[PDB]
Design a binder for this molecule. Structure first.
Ligand SMILES: O=P(O)(O)Oc1cc[n+]([C@@H]2O[C@H](COP(=O)(O)OP(=O)(O)OP(=O)(O)O)[C@@H](O)[C@H]2O)c(O)n1
Ligand SMILES: O=P(O)(O)Oc1cc[n+]([C@@H]2O[C@H](COP(=O)(O)OP(=O)(O)OP(=O)(O)O)[C@@H](O)[C@H]2O)c(O)n1
Ligand SMILES: O=P(O)(O)Oc1cc[n+]([C@@H]2O[C@H](COP(=O)(O)OP(=O)(O)OP(=O)(O)O)[C@@H](O)[C@H]2O)c(O)n1
Ligand SMILES: Nc1ncnc2c1ncn2[C@@H]1O[C@H](COP(=O)(O)OP(=O)(O)O)[C@@H](O)[C@H]1O
Ligand SMILES: Nc1ncnc2c1ncn2[C@@H]1O[C@H](COP(=O)(O)OP(=O)(O)O)[C@@H](O)[C@H]1O
Ligand SMILES: Nc1ncnc2c1ncn2[C@@H]1O[C@H](COP(=O)(O)OP(=O)(O)O)[C@@H](O)[C@H]1O
Ligand SMILES: [Mg+2]
Ligand SMILES: [Mg+2]
Ligand SMILES: [Mg+2]
Ligand SMILES: [Mg+2]
Ligand SMILES: [Mg+2]
Ligand SMILES: [Mg+2]
Lengths: 539, 539, 539
């Protein structure tokens, strides 16, 4: 029945071999999704081997965009997959890093809390990591105790930085025994075109490296570009001392939302459930089948330009792209993304050449960014051409700078991008970095309010520059409305043109793509995709 | 001739295998001695793998006593060997730790100094360590540039914590090339009594472990309890790909001062000089030959009790024992040390049984100590019996408490050892921890002044409790003189009885054993050993 | 009850760390003895990592003397411990070697039996080793199925040559599971005299090396020169993730026969029995208590000289020394062995200086031996002095050469030792190497027959030179009797002098020390020790 006896909290560790970017986090999220559908209270955590105390200092070329929690922690991208697939808000405790662990242990040492012992990588660092891992098992604020904790070990097996985390996982397996701890290992099977053969040797060496630290994998996720032959799975099972049930072929799916279907088809969830002896029920595919219908059988299609610097073949905008696809799903339209370099849009002819074929433009945020002249040039061209535009954070800032350059403020800029500008229409109110959720109030019957269908919202923020309040009345002559603000009205949070000036041009300082889920699309992307569809139909 | 052309600074790394306490630091110090006598400007450094930012938090049962520098840093015991053999004062920079390196790199990360890169154990931590190693090569404050830098890598090859230091050493060998970097490896040759054979396998495994991280030893120091046969040295040389000139048999010498002779006899210094291509001259053995005469051919002998808690077969008092032996050397007397437990001296009969055969008693300092009732009991017994006493730090505190209990203050104690005492004759003036060298003024013609033959001295301090100034006039009725003080007189630094009360009973808050050298004995220990000699002769 | 249900055959693997000669084989034999006394049918096996197909080609300086089985295989020394402690005869299958495994697999490859596969170290070599290991579990020729198979893995963990055998053991643990496979790891705890501390770090590194190949030890045998403190055992248990019940202190016992008492006192056998879930009964100590009474409480003492080349501090004569001690036990006399170099006995004065204080002389066999002039010189001196002499194999040959030089044959020798001798009294009958058991017939009422109390015996042989039948009638004039022969009389097997010529001087071509057991002493050593006792009493 739906009510089951109590059992100990199961730990499921996901580790990666050969390389990073194998979809280890996505596989963990998909397994969490399956286990949730089978009725278990899944909770998730990631361990990051890098020494940065948080990725805010990093550059999006390293690991993609940053993410933000409701308690306001700044975390890795994978927490975004966990949210999007579990449809949950996760604590800042869900992202441990070597930086945090070492700082914590050094601080404890300075206070003498180890009573004069020599502080060592074993036991003290591994003890701190094991404590942080087992803390996830404690009852939540409402007494709901997770049935499975899925922990993703970042990096690659054999990296110097992963040694403490894998040792902590080994000690957890020792403490809790094999009946409670399951190891999932993700590995790459490359295809060599010249000889036309899939090679299993990288997987064998990765599993040998994993065995060399005392971990035996329970199952293998063979990442590949094509479905692995059965003979190769048999060879891997034989060579690696892994149950032939546990070798799971995981070819590159056309979209990330097919991965749960691939894993269920291969019966990974059944294998995990049997091996951990969890109580279960069959997966109710109703919701995700509707989602996959919206994916694979859309009624129409629309092209959207994504304008940025990191667009040079990188997943620096993953959350934005997924929120775009969710918006398409709400309208049952396929959204095709045209990756447009910002610097080709600095000249009006270059902007026309890049954008002229698209049906909409998106200006995402960023940090350490440069060359926003191209972004604003794309805004100018798009407004003249009539394309809808959505500007996120820096997109809003570029919209406001465009409006400044529309009314008299030709040399206007952000103090970030021209510290000597005579018209700093964007300025520090380094100022307070706004992070996390803040409330905002919206103009009644604003386009933003028409989208959200409410006067009150909350959004995740990450920025420190603001619209300079000295220029509101000047730039309003552009026609721009400050259609949403902080509750006191002190801070501008949203801007838009009236529908008769342009059918849809909106910007927000927040990152609404971090509240979107594929089964709960965000209002603004639904609105933007609807406007793009209306443009395509009317054009 | 004495003047030679310029050459690059040579780096000599000393590493250990099989176990710690192999005399790796003493071997490094002896090699520094020999290279100094050959005329080279040797400087020395230690790398500590533990995460403690400094050993002040540790307990003397871990790695022996703590040491203190003139700039006031708190460092490992090995810096004491470096001082005692080079007769130099070393900067706090001479002791790096993993704690310091990680704290530094994490701090630099929080400040964004890596410009958005991912902070990694390689390159960033190894770069910080390599920077800290090469900083030793820079010209000193007077422009004197070291000819050789001898770096001791603490721990054992294969400890998880040593991995960054050995990688930094490997990178230094890569950067500077083999003509500048020399690796000396110290290893253990155990003797198995049942089969009567020395075993080389531990050495082979240690050298293989060292090779597995990219280091090839240039020489081997074979630590043993007996001289290694030549056949075994040949076997080791063959198996380890080491020049047969580089296998150095280093049996346990009767005293640490014979080690330079052992290494010279084996021509280790000649091998190092040839391999590094250093300019040299023959060793002038005059000074050290005189020292070894004072060591091995004394005119008389005296027995001194060392009373403490750590005395249970541990080198927690190494500096004190060596300062005692240096005092004996100044008088050409052998000082034999009887290691006496403090807790056997709590009862007067037990104190008599322990001490009755000795010619003097020494009360050294300590931290985390307990049971000073036994220490004070030993003081009481010794004073009644007429034995000379020297009290260091806690020894002075126990002397003052004994005097308190001599004049009316029977329940008197330190606030450290009885927080509820009605007479806290020792109290916090946690208060300011006095660390390092401080100046002091002495009573003219005091026994302390008679020893030092001056009215002004400076001594290294490590303590935070002080004599309570409220009780000076009360305890002076014991006959105790506050014969040395801070220049303002606010702090008591030395106490003594007049010679007619007891021929010599003196205590000092400082650690004079940290300024002693075997070739420059400290005045107070010369005085104490002279008093013990006078007792033995008169008794 | 004595009759128990059937259970699967348990595998107990014994492995060594740090070094060889740790008593790993003796510990395995003692555990086998305890388990036998608890009523289980123990069988034993050794795996030798070296490539020699059998140790016959080796030199006794490598691993001591060679051993011989009843089916005539030539095996390592440890098979001798297994026999002496189990009182059993073991098959030649009880000694696998890398040489045999590789030769077997290469031969199978040449015959195409792998059907075209690539022959690899994994699986094929490890499969052959695992097959040879599991073959021990098969029912014997009479259907008695062993309850525990104790396999000793030769070498040291981390040797290149041990990698296939430890991998085979790991695969056995995988196939049979943890309930059937138990790992015992023997490790060294060295004592460092200069700092007066036992060091556990070698054990930690050895266990880490063992874990790096996927083996977790169940118990640790800490070999040491002194009883390990309890705090160190606790530290080892904590650091190594080993049950605190499983750390077994095993100090160097005064005799090998005390080891079963040490292991039982530490409750190793109880730990093994509990962990393997074996059915058991209490150990009946009656027999071994009688043996230890004969060991520790003898009525008298006698000194015996052992004359050989390998006597320079090596266990090259272990079986002979143990048979000597068993002979002493039969008479309840302590036998003290004086290790005498052969080459000091070449001169009559040197022989007198070496032997004059002893009560008997033993001349053991050997191969690759030289300098038998010294051995024969010792025989000449001993005969003149009246000391009893026992000559084994080469001892008999030297006796016969002495007799040759007693009757006219001054230049007589073996063709082995002077190929140009004019009187080859010892000659090839390279000839047939006699190996293993052969029957012999004895002269009735010969001293040999008086000892054995029978006319028919069987003994283990290892030699290829024989007494030249052409010289029997010549050398009989010495007084020597060919008191035992092959059944056809063709081969001389024993020689003796009549009791009135010398009270006891006997030689045999065989190695009776390989049929001796401490609880079943061999007749000839009982006789020889009785003669030595009679000499001591009468002298
Ligand atoms: O992505 P996740 O989910 O696994 O999260 C991850 C992925 C990777 N890492 C670590 O960053 C460093 C470089 O990573 P990296 O794989 O990129 O190596 P590299 O030098 O850049 O070579 P490459 O060209 O292959 O990228 C390594 O120490 C990694 O262990 C962390 O902490 N979290
Ligand atoms: O002495 P130095 O000059 O080399 O300075 C030293 C000596 C040792 N260490 C480190 O402390 C830990 C335990 O040391 P440790 O040898 O004592 O092992 P253990 O567990 O206690 O076994 P054991 O019984 O043999 O002592 C290890 O991580 C070492 O790397 C450091 O940083 N500097
Ligand atoms: O005795 P067992 O029962 O373990 O049976 C043994 C002992 C040792 N071995 C192997 O012989 C080689 C040298 O042995 P070895 O320990 O003596 O090293 P080495 O070079 O001589 O240095 P060391 O001075 O310490 O002797 C190694 O390959 C060992 O793995 C074998 O096959 N059986
Ligand atoms: N099985 C897959 N099929 C298709 N695309 C994929 C798959 N797995 C991952 N991806 C994509 O590859 C990128 C990297 O995957 P990711 O989850 O982030 O691995 P990791 O966290 O270890 O770095 C993701 O943006 C994801 O969308
Ligand atoms: N070659 C030696 N002969 C005799 N005693 C020794 C020798 N080397 C070292 N010792 C002693 O053994 C102890 C260990 O030496 P130590 O300097 O601490 O080496 P490490 O840095 O590894 O800890 C010291 O107390 C030292 O006095
Ligand atoms: N625990 C012990 N106490 C005393 N003597 C011992 C002990 N163990 C072994 N020995 C002796 O040391 C020698 C080597 O032991 P051994 O069994 O042969 O180890 P291994 O086979 O691994 O080489 C043996 O001759 C044995 O008599
Ligand atoms: Mg990634
Ligand atoms: Mg990368
Ligand atoms: Mg040390
Ligand atoms: Mg230690
Ligand atoms: Mg052996
Ligand atoms: Mg050997």
């Amino acid at each position: 029945m739906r009510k089951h006896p109590q059992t100990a909290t199961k730990h499921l560790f996901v580790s990666g071999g050969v390389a990073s970017s194998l979809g280890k986090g996505l596989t963990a999220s998909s397994l969490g999704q399956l286990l949730t559908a089978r009725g278990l209270h899944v909770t998730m955590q990631k361990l990051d081997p890098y020494l940065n105390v948080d990725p805010g200092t990093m550059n999006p070329f390293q690991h993609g965009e940053v993410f933000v929690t409701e308690d306001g922690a700044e975390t890795d991208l994978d927490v975004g997959h966990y949210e999007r697939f579990l449809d949950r808000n996760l604590p800042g405790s869900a992202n441990v890093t070597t930086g945090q662990v070492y700082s914590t242990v050094i601080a404890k040492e300075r206070r003498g809390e180890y009573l004069g012992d020599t502080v060592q990588v074993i036991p003290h660092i591994t003890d701190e990591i094991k404590r942080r891992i087992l803390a996830m098992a404690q009852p939540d604020a409402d007494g709901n105790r997770p049935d499975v904790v899925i922990t993703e070990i970042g990096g690659t097996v054999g990296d110097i930085e992963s040694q403490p985390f894998l040792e902590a996982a080994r000690q957890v397996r020792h403490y809790l025994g094999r009946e409670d701890v399951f190891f999932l290992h993700v590995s790459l099977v490359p295809y060599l075109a010249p000889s036309g053969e899939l090679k299993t040797k990288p997987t064998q060496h990765s599993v040998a490296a994993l065995r060399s630290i005392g971990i035996t994998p329970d199952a293998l996720i063979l990442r590949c570009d094509r479905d692995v032959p059965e003979a190769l799975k048999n060879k891997i099972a034989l060579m690696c001392d892994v149950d032939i049930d546990g070798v799971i072929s995981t070819p590159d799916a056309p979209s990330i939302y097919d991965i749960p279907k691939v894993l269920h088809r291969e019966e990974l969830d059944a294998f995990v459930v049997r091996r951990l002896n969890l109580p279960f029920r069959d997966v109710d595919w109703t919701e995700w089948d509707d989602l996959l219908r919206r994916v694979h059988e859309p009624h129409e299609t629309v092209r959207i330009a994504l304008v940025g610097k990191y667009v040079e073949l990188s997943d620096a905008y993953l959350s934005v792209a997924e929120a775009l696809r969710a918006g398409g799903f709400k309208h049952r339209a396929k959204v095709e993304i045209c990756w447009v370099a910002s610097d080709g849009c600095e000249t009006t002819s270059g902007a026309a050449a890049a954008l002229g074929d698209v049906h909409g433009v998106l200006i995402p945020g960023g940090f350490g960014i440069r060359g926003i002249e191209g972004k604003i040039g794309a805004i100018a061209y798009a407004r003249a051409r009539g394309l809808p535009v959505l500007g996120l954070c820096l997109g809003l800032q570029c919209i406001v700078i465009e409006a400044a350059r529309s009314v008299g403020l030709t040399n206007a800029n952000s103090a970030e991008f021209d510290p000597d500008t005579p018209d700093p229409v964007i300025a520090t109110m380094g100022g307070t970095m706004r992070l996390g959720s803040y409330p905002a109030v919206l103009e009644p019957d604003s386009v933003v309010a028409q989208a959200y269908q409410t006067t009150q919202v909350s959004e995740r923020h990450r920025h420190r520059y603001e619209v300079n309040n000295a220029y509101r009345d000047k730039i309003a002559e552009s026609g721009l409305r400050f259609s949403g603000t902080s509750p006191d009205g002190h801070l501008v949070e949203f801007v838009e043109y009236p529908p008769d000036r342009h059918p849809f041009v909106v910007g927000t300082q927040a990152h609404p793509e971090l509240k979107s889920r594929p089964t709960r699309p965000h209002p603004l992307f639904v609105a933007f995709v609807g406007a793009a569809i209306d443009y395509k139909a009317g054009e």
